[PDB]
Design a protein around this ligand. Structure first.
Ligand SMILES: *[C@@H]1O[C@H](CO)[C@@H](O)[C@H](O)[C@H]1NC(C)=O
Lengths: 15, 40, 255
C-alpha cells in the first residue's frame, strides 16, 4: 500500500 | 467593494472577495506583500 | 515555482489544486472565484496533441491546501465538477491565445480561514495596477527546478513575486505571436532575481493586492511559465480582465 500511493488517500470525512 | 454578478448564477463570495481571513481580516501581514506594495 | 518560498498557511485562500481522479495526479493550479466557480487554464483541460481532453468526470479540485500530498483533514475540501467550460476560441495549435477555462462545482464549497475567493478585476483595477515593474504574485505546486540534475517537487505550496514586463519587450522575447489577451512577467537576464512559474503551475493565479481597498485581484492565469525545463525569457499569463466578458457569458448562462 502506502508507498504505492503518491498521494495520501483523501475521502474520509465525505458526503 | 461593488459586485458585478448575480449571486444565484455565480454563487456566494463576490461581495467579500479578495480579503484574506488570516491576514487582512486579522490586521496581519504575510512575509512579502511589502515587496509588492513597494513596487507599486 | 522556481526561486520562491514555502507559502504561509492561508496566504492564498483561493489557490485550487486541479487533480486527476486516476491515475491520481496533480495536473495544474487553479483559483476559486466564488463558492461555485473555479478558474484555470484551458491547456490544463484540453490539448489534442497529447491526447488531453478531460471531462467533468475525470477531474476533481482540492481547496484550502498547503501540503502537496498529505490529506489535510478538516482543512482542505474536495469538490467534484459539474461542468467544464473551455473558451471556444482557445488557441492550442499555435499560441494559447484565450488560454482559460471555467469549472462549475458540483456543490458550493464552504469558505473558512483557508478557503476564500479572489476578486476578478474591473477596468479601473486593470489600468491602475497592470503596469510594467509592478510585482504580482504567483502560487503553485509546480516543480522547483528544471528536471534531470536535491528534489524538484515541493512538499508545500510555493509563492514567488514577479514583475510585469513591457509588452513590446514580451513580444520580442519570442517567435510566438503574442496577443492582447496575454501579458508577460518576470525579471531580466542580467537581473539579479530570477523566479518563475513552471509547467505544473499552469492554470494557477497571478494576483495583485490593491493599494486602495486592500483586496486581492487575479490579473492573469499562468499560461506558460518560463521556468524549470521550459526556459524562455518571460512567463506568459492569460489576461483575465480581457476575458471578463466571456466569463459572464458563461456564468450568467450556465450556472
Ligand atoms: C474532445 O474534444 C474534441 C476536440 O476539441 C471534440 O471534438 C470532442 O467532442 C471531445 N471529446 C468527446 C467525444 O466528448
Amino acid at each position: 500500500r502506502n508507498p504505492n500511493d503518491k498521494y495520501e488517500p483523501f475521502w474520509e470525512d465525505e458526503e | 467593494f461593488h459586485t458585478f454578478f448575480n449571486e444565484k448564477t455565480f454563487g456566494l463570495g463576490e461581495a467579500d472577495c479578495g480579503l484574506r481571513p488570516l491576514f487582512e481580516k486579522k490586521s496581519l501581514k504575510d512575509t512579502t506583500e511589502k515587496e509588492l506594495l513597494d513596487s507599486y | 515555482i522556481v526561486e520562491g518560498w514555502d507559502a504561509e498557511k492561508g496566504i492564498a485562500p483561493w489557490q485550487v489544486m486541479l487533480f486527476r481522479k486516476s491515475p491520481q495526479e496533480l495536473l495544474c493550479g487553479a483559483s476559486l472565484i466564488s463558492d461555485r466557480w473555479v478558474l484555470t487554464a484551458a491547456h490544463c483541460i484540453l490539448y489534442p496533441p497529447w491526447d488531453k481532453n478531460f471531462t467533468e468526470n475525470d477531474l476533481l479540485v482540492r481547496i484550502g491546501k498547503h501540503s502537496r500530498t498529505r490529506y489535510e483533514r478538516n482543512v482542505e475540501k474536495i469538490s467534484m465538477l459539474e461542468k467544464i467550460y473551455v473558451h471556444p476560441r482557445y488557441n492550442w495549435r499555435e499560441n494559447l491565445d484565450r488560454d482559460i477555462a471555467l469549472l462549475k462545482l458540483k456543490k458550493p464549497v464552504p469558505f473558512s480561514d483557508y478557503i476564500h475567493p479572489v476578486c476578478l478585476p474591473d477596468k479601473q483595477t486593470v489600468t491602475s495596477l497592470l503596469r510594467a515593474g509592478y510585482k504580482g504574485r504567483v502560487t503553485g505546486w509546480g516543480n522547483l527546478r528544471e528536471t534531470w540534475t536535491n528534489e524538484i517537487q515541493p512538499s508545500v505550496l510555493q509563492v514567488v513575486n514577479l514583475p510585469i514586463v513591457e509588452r513590446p519587450v514580451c513580444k520580442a522575447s519570442t517567435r510566438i505571436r503574442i496577443t492582447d489577451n496575454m501579458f508577460c512577467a518576470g525579471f531580466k537576464v542580467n537581473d539579479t532575481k530570477r523566479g518563475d512559474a513552471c509547467e505544473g503551475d499552469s492554470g494557477g493565479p497571478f494576483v495583485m493586492k490593491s493599494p486602495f481597498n486592500n483586496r486581492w485581484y487575479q490579473m492573469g492565469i499562468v499560461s506558460a511559465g518560463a521556468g524549470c525545463d521550459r526556459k524562455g525569457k518571460y512567463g506568459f499569463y492569460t489576461h483575465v480582465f480581457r476575458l471578463k466578458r466571456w466569463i459572464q457569458k458563461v456564468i450568467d448562462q450556465f450556472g
